[PDB]
Design a protein around this motif. Structure first.
Motif, PDB file in Angstrom:
ATOM      1  N   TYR A   1      -2.979   4.258 -17.701  1.00 31.54           N
ATOM      2  CA  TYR A   1      -2.763   5.339 -16.838  1.00 31.54           C
ATOM      3  C   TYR A   1      -2.131   4.778 -15.486  1.00 31.54           C
ATOM      4  CZ  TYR A   1      -6.808   2.449 -14.986  1.00 31.54           C
ATOM      5  OH  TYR A   1      -7.533   1.292 -14.696  1.00 31.54           O
ATOM      6  N   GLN A   2      -1.896   5.736 -14.392  1.00 33.27           N
ATOM      7  CA  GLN A   2      -1.151   5.437 -13.464  1.00 33.27           C
ATOM      8  C   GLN A   2      -2.020   5.555 -11.972  1.00 33.27           C
ATOM      9  OE1 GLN A   2       1.975   4.864 -13.491  1.00 33.27           O
ATOM     10  NE2 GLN A   2       3.020   5.456 -11.801  1.00 33.27           N
ATOM     11  N   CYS A   3      -1.671   4.213 -11.391  1.00 30.01           N
ATOM     12  CA  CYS A   3      -2.574   4.118 -10.224  1.00 30.01           C
ATOM     13  C   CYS A   3      -1.801   4.009  -8.965  1.00 30.01           C
ATOM     14  CB  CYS A   3      -3.442   2.793 -10.277  1.00 30.01           C
ATOM     15  SG  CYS A   3      -4.783   2.733 -10.692  1.00 30.01           S
ATOM     16  N   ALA A   4      -2.268   4.182  -7.700  1.00 31.82           N
ATOM     17  CA  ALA A   4      -1.710   3.618  -6.360  1.00 31.82           C
ATOM     18  C   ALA A   4      -2.491   2.513  -5.800  1.00 31.82           C
ATOM     19  CB  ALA A   4      -1.568   4.911  -5.488  1.00 31.82           C
TER      20      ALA A   4
ATOM     21  N   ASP B   1      -1.788  12.391  -2.976  1.00 37.18           N
ATOM     22  CA  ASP B   1      -1.052  11.277  -2.243  1.00 37.18           C
ATOM     23  C   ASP B   1      -0.750  10.081  -3.241  1.00 37.18           C
ATOM     24  OD1 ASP B   1      -3.494   9.708  -2.374  1.00 37.18           O
ATOM     25  OD2 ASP B   1      -3.306   9.176  -0.131  1.00 37.18           O
ATOM     26  N   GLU B   2      -0.808   9.869  -4.566  1.00 34.25           N
ATOM     27  CA  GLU B   2      -0.497   9.326  -5.458  1.00 34.25           C
ATOM     28  C   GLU B   2       0.588   9.124  -6.266  1.00 34.25           C
ATOM     29  OE1 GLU B   2      -3.720   6.958  -7.482  1.00 34.25           O
ATOM     30  OE2 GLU B   2      -4.844   6.792  -5.505  1.00 34.25           O
ATOM     31  N   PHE B   3       1.693  10.094  -5.903  1.00 33.67           N
ATOM     32  CA  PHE B   3       3.145   9.927  -6.112  1.00 33.67           C
ATOM     33  C   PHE B   3       3.985   9.651  -5.069  1.00 33.67           C
ATOM     34  CE2 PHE B   3       0.882  13.410  -8.854  1.00 33.67           C
ATOM     35  CZ  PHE B   3       1.231  13.024 -10.206  1.00 33.67           C
ATOM     36  N   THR B   4       4.762   8.611  -5.280  1.00 33.07           N
ATOM     37  CA  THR B   4       5.610   8.285  -4.420  1.00 33.07           C
ATOM     38  C   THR B   4       7.034   9.078  -4.429  1.00 33.07           C
ATOM     39  OG1 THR B   4       7.030   6.982  -5.836  1.00 33.07           O
ATOM     40  CG2 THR B   4       5.051   5.806  -4.631  1.00 33.07           C
ATOM     41  N   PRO B   5       8.095   8.834  -3.544  1.00 33.05           N
ATOM     42  CA  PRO B   5       9.161   9.772  -3.781  1.00 33.05           C
ATOM     43  C   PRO B   5       9.864   9.260  -5.071  1.00 33.05           C
ATOM     44  CG  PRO B   5       8.828   9.203  -1.413  1.00 33.05           C
ATOM     45  CD  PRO B   5       7.849   8.498  -2.316  1.00 33.05           C
TER      46      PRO B   5
ATOM     47  N   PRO C   1       0.912  -1.121   0.181  1.00 31.72           N
ATOM     48  CA  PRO C   1       0.080   0.130  -0.108  1.00 31.72           C
ATOM     49  C   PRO C   1       1.046   1.310   0.071  1.00 31.72           C
ATOM     50  CG  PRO C   1      -0.722  -1.493   1.868  1.00 31.72           C
ATOM     51  CD  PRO C   1       0.496  -2.112   1.309  1.00 31.72           C
ATOM     52  N   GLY C   2       0.454   2.092  -0.881  1.00 29.37           N
ATOM     53  CA  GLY C   2       1.369   3.489  -1.025  1.00 29.37           C
ATOM     54  C   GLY C   2       2.029   3.523  -2.268  1.00 29.37           C
ATOM     55  N   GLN C   3       2.349   2.302  -2.977  1.00 29.07           N
ATOM     56  CA  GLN C   3       3.309   2.074  -3.937  1.00 29.07           C
ATOM     57  C   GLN C   3       2.358   2.446  -5.086  1.00 29.07           C
ATOM     58  OE1 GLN C   3       5.723  -1.866  -2.936  1.00 29.07           O
ATOM     59  NE2 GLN C   3       6.836  -0.519  -4.303  1.00 29.07           N
ATOM     60  N   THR C   4       2.807   2.975  -6.287  1.00 28.71           N
ATOM     61  CA  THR C   4       2.277   3.061  -7.578  1.00 28.71           C
ATOM     62  C   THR C   4       2.477   2.284  -8.510  1.00 28.71           C
ATOM     63  OG1 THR C   4       4.051   4.769  -8.135  1.00 28.71           O
ATOM     64  CG2 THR C   4       2.074   5.556  -7.057  1.00 28.71           C
ATOM     65  N   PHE C   5       1.618   2.277  -9.890  1.00 30.84           N
ATOM     66  CA  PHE C   5       2.077   1.382 -10.663  1.00 30.84           C
ATOM     67  C   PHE C   5       1.284   1.929 -11.900  1.00 30.84           C
ATOM     68  CE2 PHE C   5      -1.901  -1.158 -10.378  1.00 30.84           C
ATOM     69  CZ  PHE C   5      -2.055  -0.917  -9.227  1.00 30.84           C
ATOM     70  N   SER C   6       1.648   1.207 -13.254  1.00 27.35           N
ATOM     71  CA  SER C   6       0.922   1.669 -14.393  1.00 27.35           C
ATOM     72  C   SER C   6      -0.031   0.470 -14.677  1.00 27.35           C
ATOM     73  CB  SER C   6       1.947   1.802 -15.470  1.00 27.35           C
ATOM     74  OG  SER C   6       2.599   2.684 -15.465  1.00 27.35           O
TER      75      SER C   6
ATOM     76  N   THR D   1       0.764   9.701   3.625  1.00 28.72           N
ATOM     77  CA  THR D   1       1.545  10.997   4.032  1.00 28.72           C
ATOM     78  C   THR D   1       2.996  11.314   3.306  1.00 28.72           C
ATOM     79  OG1 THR D   1       0.497  10.550   6.323  1.00 28.72           O
ATOM     80  CG2 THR D   1       2.440  12.274   5.999  1.00 28.72           C
ATOM     81  N   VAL D   2       3.579  10.076   3.305  1.00 27.57           N
ATOM     82  CA  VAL D   2       5.036  10.270   2.776  1.00 27.57           C
ATOM     83  C   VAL D   2       4.770  10.615   0.955  1.00 27.57           C
ATOM     84  CG1 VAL D   2       5.113   7.625   2.069  1.00 27.57           C
ATOM     85  CG2 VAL D   2       7.192   9.378   2.363  1.00 27.57           C
ATOM     86  N   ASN D   3       3.739  10.318   0.420  1.00 24.61           N
ATOM     87  CA  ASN D   3       3.727  10.609  -0.799  1.00 24.61           C
ATOM     88  C   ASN D   3       3.309  12.064  -1.024  1.00 24.61           C
ATOM     89  OD1 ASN D   3       4.230   7.931  -1.401  1.00 24.61           O
ATOM     90  ND2 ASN D   3       2.181   7.480  -2.242  1.00 24.61           N
ATOM     91  N   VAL D   4       2.357  12.608  -0.088  1.00 23.43           N
ATOM     92  CA  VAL D   4       2.069  13.886  -0.004  1.00 23.43           C
ATOM     93  C   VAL D   4       3.167  15.080   0.157  1.00 23.43           C
ATOM     94  CG1 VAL D   4       0.625  15.867   1.064  1.00 23.43           C
ATOM     95  CG2 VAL D   4      -0.492  13.447   0.809  1.00 23.43           C
ATOM     96  N   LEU D   5       4.000  14.433   1.110  1.00 18.53           N
ATOM     97  CA  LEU D   5       5.299  15.241   1.205  1.00 18.53           C
ATOM     98  C   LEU D   5       6.160  15.278  -0.057  1.00 18.53           C
ATOM     99  CD1 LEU D   5       6.267  14.073   4.787  1.00 18.53           C
ATOM    100  CD2 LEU D   5       5.519  16.368   4.245  1.00 18.53           C
ATOM    101  N   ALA D   6       6.348  13.880  -0.667  1.00 19.49           N
ATOM    102  CA  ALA D   6       6.974  14.207  -2.063  1.00 19.49           C
ATOM    103  C   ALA D   6       6.415  14.789  -2.879  1.00 19.49           C
ATOM    104  CB  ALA D   6       6.946  12.578  -2.511  1.00 19.49           C
ATOM    105  N   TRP D   7       4.998  14.936  -3.036  1.00 22.05           N
ATOM    106  CA  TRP D   7       4.511  15.723  -4.053  1.00 22.05           C
ATOM    107  C   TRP D   7       4.783  17.327  -3.802  1.00 22.05           C
ATOM    108  CZ3 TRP D   7       0.031  18.499  -2.780  1.00 22.05           C
ATOM    109  CH2 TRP D   7      -0.771  19.356  -3.782  1.00 22.05           C
ATOM    110  N   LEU D   8       4.753  17.633  -2.367  1.00 32.18           N
ATOM    111  CA  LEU D   8       5.035  19.071  -2.074  1.00 32.18           C
ATOM    112  C   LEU D   8       6.489  19.301  -2.217  1.00 32.18           C
ATOM    113  CD1 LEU D   8       3.398  19.206   1.324  1.00 32.18           C
ATOM    114  CD2 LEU D   8       2.677  20.251  -0.526  1.00 32.18           C
TER     115      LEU D   8
END
Ligand SMILES: O=C(NCc1cccs1)[C@@H]1CN(C(=O)c2cccnc2)CCN1c1ccc(Cl)c(Cl)c1
Length: 301
Positions: free
Chosen positions: A126-129, A289-293, A108-113, A201-208
């Motif tokens: 498309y991209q998903c988390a 929140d759907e972009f990882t670092p 959970p929290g990882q993304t994929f196409s 949360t970590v993904n929101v921070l990455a997106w910031l």
């Protein structure tokens, strides 16, 4: 510059998609080497749905009951077996377009196409988390079962998702390519529903950080917070706890921007408590929140 929901190029996966028909049901399969993988519910009938015994349903099948088509070329099924909630149909021909690949279960929290497919033909990408509640907010229509999610590392396709169902709220559930469901969902008729979800949360921070790299700085402030105090706020707004490992993972982005992670956390706390006051970040009026670092580094250098 710029920041988009960016998927991996899908060509290596397009060449693996086939059509699988059993009875009156048609869906998609994944053809790698001399095996086609697809959801086992392809063998269900309308009357089987309350409590299908898939072992019985499969014992009653023959190879000739599975029609497999790779474009305009029919593949002969020479063996069939169940692995958890997928079917493995052995075919007489190895796929000449098989890429280097791995089957890899994601967190959970990882993304994929996702390569959405119908009748074995790719339709879009498309991209998903993977959400904390083990659903995905996909885009899928009738006929899309057996569509797959993947990441690409160099030349190697890491398959992580096969599509099985749509839940009553419109979100989606499926399995890894070993046939094991993500989350507490089952391939039988029930009142199952997505559980409560949280924000990654970590993904929101990455997106910031992505935003700062792209010139959006209005939400920055001179303050820093402690990890403990930030996590108190996170809990109150239904955000996942932030760990020291998350802080470490964000290190490269913190270094590129010169903004310490706990400094960015103070910005996030203020955005959660005050909102955005009519402003936007990377074209969004909500915290994404759907972009990882890794996704951010891949797109922002
Ligand atoms: O979710 C489904 N049905 C409700 C459920 C009934 C039992 C468990 S869930 C999907 C909907 N179908 C689509 O093509 C589709 C539509 C929209 C978006 N993605 C896919 C057809 C197949 N259907 C199905 C049938 C039998 C099983 Cl066992 C399973 Cl897992 C799935």
């Amino acid at each position: 510059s710029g920041f988009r929901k960016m998927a991996f190029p899908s060509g290596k996966v397009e060449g693996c998609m086939v059509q699988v028909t059993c009875g009156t049901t048609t869906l998609n399969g994944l053809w790698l080497d001399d095996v086609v993988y697809c959801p086992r519910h392809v063998i269900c009938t309308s009357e089987d749905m309350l409590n299908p015994n898939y072992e019985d349903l499969l014992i009653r099948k023959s190879n000739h009951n599975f029609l497999v088509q790779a474009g305009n070329v029919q593949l002969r099924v020479i063996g069939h077996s169940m692995q958890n909630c997928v079917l493995k149909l052995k075919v007489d021909t190895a796929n000449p377009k098989t890429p280097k690949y791995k089957f890899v279960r994601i967190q959970p929290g990882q993304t994929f196409s996702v390569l959405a497919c119908y009748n074995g033909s790719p339709s879009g990408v498309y991209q998903c988390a993977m959400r904390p509640n083990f659903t995905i907010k996909g885009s899928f229509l009738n006929g899309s079962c057996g569509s797959v999610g993947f990441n690409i590392d160099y030349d190697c396709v890491s398959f992580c998702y096969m599509h099985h169902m749509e839940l009553p709220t419109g979100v989606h559930a499926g399995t890894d390519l070993e046939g094991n469901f993500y989350g507490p969902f089952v391939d039988r008729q029930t009142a199952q529903a997505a559980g409560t979800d949280t924000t990654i949360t970590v993904n929101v921070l990455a997106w910031l950080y992505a935003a700062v790299i792209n010139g959006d700085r209005w939400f920055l402030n001179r303050f820093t917070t402690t990890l403990n105090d930030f996590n108190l706020v996170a809990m109150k707004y239904n955000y996942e706890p932030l760990t020291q490992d998350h802080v470490d993972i964000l290190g490269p982005l913190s270094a590129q921007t010169g903004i310490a992670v706990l400094d960015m956390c103070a910005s996030l706390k203020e955005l959660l408590q005050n909102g955005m006051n009519g402003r936007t970040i990377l074209g969004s009026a909500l915290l994404e929140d759907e972009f990882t670092p890794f996704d951010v580094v891949r797109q922002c250098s």
